[PDB]
Design a protein around this ligand. Structure first.
Ligand SMILES: O=C(O)CCC(=O)C(=O)O
Ligand SMILES: O=C(O)CCC(=O)C(=O)O
Lengths: 385, 384
């Protein structure tokens, strides 16, 4: 039982072969297409490909500072959840925003709705939601706590590509949504990330900031510079926004196109595996599993040691490993235990983070893949007895 | 054209190898490549990252995380007025105040007499850029810093392989940055490196490159001191506000190959330049670059002589219709970029008259690792 498995076939391999014979390796044809199908795939107007889910988060944030009428500015308050990957947080700190952490809900593993409604205020300029483990946030309920102030909605959808709510694609709820194409995820392009949006102005700020803050990937009339000059001796060396060089590589673009085709069955295998998993673990003596929302893409399986259950986490761990079972902390556990990097943040905690503290000491995680795991899952129910 | 393919069958083979091992995330190849890279330019340590741009990005951020921080926001760092955009963004992104310094019209590197004046009690750092393969005269810059606590940095993206005083450009500063982007000296599709002789700096980079986690860090390290054995925990701890800027295994593998070739690329580039200089030596209206130490001859700049009476624009039209692909020297005068400068906290030491001038009567055509005698002769003729 591995936390991970390959998602490639010969198709990806000749996809690489193909980018070779072209002898055009820098972000190009492949990307553009991948970016087109990506959007077609999840129901957005615009998608943008970058070097990683991480850089996609960097860009998602940086962007809101370059809108003609800026949407964020330093010191602004943005709310986020206590549980998520490191790079969900960094950008906030890098852009000098004031972070308000909010305890997650122990059943869904996502951000606590009651806790949220009470933490959102006048100052709250944005809400950075995170779809944890394929599980989407209940967006209807988030949209009510907001309704209908001028408060930004974004989603780090890096763990839940293919998840859905009300039959709306996760990642497509935010003003911007991010995805990650890193090895261990739903699809793998070696490294890769994607930002979608339906917002024209955001779209263009992205194009610009992903590559040097120049104008070459911008259209003749754009939402940033207005009208590009025809004199390439000048228009080609014009810098309009402090960006980065976050270009994805043609190869990833080409691999992505492919992965996007296997996606559906990828997602089918996973939900059928989860179905089963839930059956086998339904009424467990000492562990709770994730409470699903919408239709999850089931990144992995989380377990949470039942309160007053006398079981000791590092005992189960031993057991699983000794049984050839790969397991790990859910995501990264309580992000707030990271006292050191925190000293660099301008953050605060709403109420408490008791749930995350509890998930930090009592939670474990085992993977889900896009190949059947009935057997293994069967073996898992035995070890955990 | 202007850019050209530095690849033979070996790099293609390297790529298979990675496919074969079926391990595409920053792993062994990167590590070998970093080891070889260090030993190659004679630096203690090396770190490889996604592009040259993320190389400079990390260089700046790194100084912010040392136990005893070398830079704090609003600190003064000096830079010359001519370079590639990503040399600047990082300072802006880091909240530093930037004092621009004019280049010297001969070397195209920062003018020393101005630096001599520009440097003050508040000046905390100095970021030099070896332009077009040309190294800066470090002897006079070190002289100028004297023995003061002033950090010297290098953006060595256009001058990989050049040398000054027998020492390798990129290795004079606390840190140095290289690019292995398509059109550069070597090419790993995309990619860059950071070199340093400082261990805590080393450790910090390994940490900021990858989620500011501890994984690429040694047991006893400069950032956390001493890692624990419980990976359940250790493997999920985060200590610095880093990024995800991991280069690709495939880019690591390609680099190593590129690395053996270099020396030769370099002889051919230098070879070409030599022919070049004899050919435009006494040009009636064109000024070329004055070499310092041993340029790696990134490409060929031309600066229209004062008085000449010749228009930059016609030189272009000409080169074009002669199918010779040309461009701006680097990006020309960076300061003309008003819209972005809006986001900076900057100042201009005196004036950048030279930058101003280069921008309008300067043009560049490239240099490649294959012998170009004939093109140069046609060049001379076209630029009659
Ligand atoms: O290391 C990465 O790029 C992805 C890390 C991640 O997503 C995870 O392990 O949760
Ligand atoms: O495309 C890039 O990465 C920028 C290349 C560069 O530095 C140049 O054109 O001078």
């Amino acid at each position: 039982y591995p936390l991970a498995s390959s998602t490639w076939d010969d198709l990806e391999y000749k996809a690489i072969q193909s980018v070779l014979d072209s002898k055009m390796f820098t972000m190009g044809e492949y990307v553009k297409q991948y970016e087109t199908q990506f959007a077609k795939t999840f129901g957005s107007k615009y998608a943008v490909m970058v070097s990683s889910g991480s850089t996609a988060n960097l860009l998602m944030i940086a962007a809101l500072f370059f809108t003609k009428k800026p949407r964020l500015k330093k010191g602004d308050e943005i709310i986020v959840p206590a549980v998520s990957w490191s790079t969900t947080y960094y950008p906030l700190q890098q852009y000098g925003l004031r972070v308000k952490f909010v305890d997650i809900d122990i059943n869904t593993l996502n951000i606590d709705i009651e806790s949220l409604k009470e933490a959102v205020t006048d100052s709250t300029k944005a809400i950075l939601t995170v779809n944890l483990l394929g599980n989407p946030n209940n967006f209807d309920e988030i949209n009510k706590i907001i309704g209908g102030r001028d408060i930004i909605l974004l989603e780090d959808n890096c763990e839940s590509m293919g998840a859905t709510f009300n039959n709306k694609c996760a990642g497509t709820f935010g003003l911007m949504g991010t995805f990650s194409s890193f090895y261990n995820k739903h699809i793998a392009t070696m490294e890769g990330g994607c930002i979608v949006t339906d917002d024209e102005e955001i779209y263009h700020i992205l194009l610009c900031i992903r590559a040097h803050g120049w104008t070459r990937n911008l259209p003749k009339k754009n939402k940033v510079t207005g009208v590009k000059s025809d004199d390439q001796f000048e228009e080609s060396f014009k810098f309009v926004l402090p960006g980065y060089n976050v270009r994805p590589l043609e190869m990833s673009g080409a691999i992505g196109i492919e992965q996007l085709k296997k996606l559906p069955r990828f997602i089918s295998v996973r939900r059928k595996n989860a179905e089963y998993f839930l059956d086998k673990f339904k009424d467990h003596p000492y562990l709770d599993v994730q409470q699903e929302t919408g239709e999850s893409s089931w990144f992995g399986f989380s377990f949470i040691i039942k309160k007053d259950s006398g079981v000791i986490r590092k005992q189960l761990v031993e057991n699983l490993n000794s049984a050839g079972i790969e397991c790990r902390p859910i995501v990264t556990g309580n992000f707030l235990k990271n006292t050191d990097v925190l000293k660099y943040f301008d953050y605060t905690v709403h109420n408490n983070v008791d749930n995350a503290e509890y998930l930090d000491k009592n939670g474990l995680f085992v993977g889900n893949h896009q190949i059947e795991l009935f057997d293994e899952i069967d073996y898992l129910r035995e070890v955990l007895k």
